[PDB]
Amino acid sequence: SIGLAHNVTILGSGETTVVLGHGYGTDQSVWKLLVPYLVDDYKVLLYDHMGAGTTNPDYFDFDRYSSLEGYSYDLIAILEEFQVSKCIYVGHSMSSMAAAVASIFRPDLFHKLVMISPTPRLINTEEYYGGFEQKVMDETLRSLDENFKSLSLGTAPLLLACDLESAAMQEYCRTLFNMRPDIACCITRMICGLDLRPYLGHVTVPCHIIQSSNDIMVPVAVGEYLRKNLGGPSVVEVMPTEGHLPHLSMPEVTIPVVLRHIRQDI
């Protein structure tokens, strides 16, 4: 069953459903501290996207999840299996961009998107600054299979902006290494090879863009690029945080920001 495969959890009660989507390297447990502040006022649906260590590797289709739409379609199927419509989608990074792509196909299913650290593209052009020159990426992406443990341990402190003893880093690494490595390399390649710029103008759902002020994956200019190129209403809030996963590494600052954007409409 769709619910089984994605470990779907539904909590709370409310006319509106808030749908929580974890990013790369984590699972739905990443929202442990946001969830108690939602249950009294909303229904909350949590799910694990395919390829997470909590999910069965034998439902991972390498061809399907080599493109982000594969996740968008899963999301559509899940929202349909549980009779959710015009939901509040809260997603971190890739998951927020996959929900945006899902909103293109079925805008009836989303009332607003809340995007924590989103980016439409990592690799620079002469046009657009995403934070990574192409041949740095090409060097990591062709080495990545040999690299994966050493590369993840080495960049995790800079990615999270956390120390090695931090609980956040240990927990991120714990879930990160519960993925089968071939699966993890597939998702990584897909994330790095992303160019969603042709589709931003076709997103029409309201978008709340929540970013870290210091995120090595997401230059602060990317948040404003999204706002000026999205087809519908949007708002950008740059938090005084560090790290690509501020909901995990600095929940004390991030959680009230996420809550305010969940609860207040553009």
Binding test (CB under 8 A) with its own copies, winner from 32, 86, 142, 149:
149
Binding test (CB under 8 A) with its own copies, winner from 10, 35, 39, 104:
104
CA nearest to 224, candidates 207, 199, 205 = 207
| 215: its two tokens | 């995120």
User: Phi, psi (5° rounding) for residue 245?
Assistant: -120, 65
Q: Kindly tell me the burial class for residue 214, based on how many C-beta atoms sit within 10 Å of its own C-beta (0-12, 13-18, 19 or more).
A: middle
| 196: its two tokens | 């969603």
| 19: its two tokens | 């749908």
Q: How many CB atoms lie within 10 A of CB 266?
A: 11
Residue whose entry in the numeric block shows the structure tokens 């990074």: 93
Binding test (CB under 8 A) with its own copies, winner from 37, 105, 128, 132:
105
- CB nearer its own copies, residue 135 or residue 198: 198
Q: How many residues bind its own copies (CB under 8 A)?
A: 25
- CB nearer its own copies, residue 15 or residue 63: 63
Q: How many CB atoms lie within 10 A of CB 40?
A: 9
- 229 marked as part of a ligand binding site: yes
CB of 163 to its own copies, least distance (A): 4
Q: Is 93 a catalytic residue?
A: yes
Catalytic residue among 22, 215, 249, 261: 215
- CB nearer its own copies, residue 199 or residue 225: 199
C-alpha torsion 251→254→257→261, nearest 10: -90
Question: Mask of contacts with its own copies, 200-239, x by CB under 8 A?
Answer: --x-------------------------------------
Q: Is 92 a catalytic residue?
A: no
CB 145 within 8 A of CB 108: no
| By the rule CB under 8 A, 164 interacts with its own copies | yes
Active site residues: 93, 215, 244
Binding site for its own copies (CB under 8 A): 66-69, 101, 104-107, 149-150, 153-154, 157, 163-165, 170, 193-196, 198-199, 202
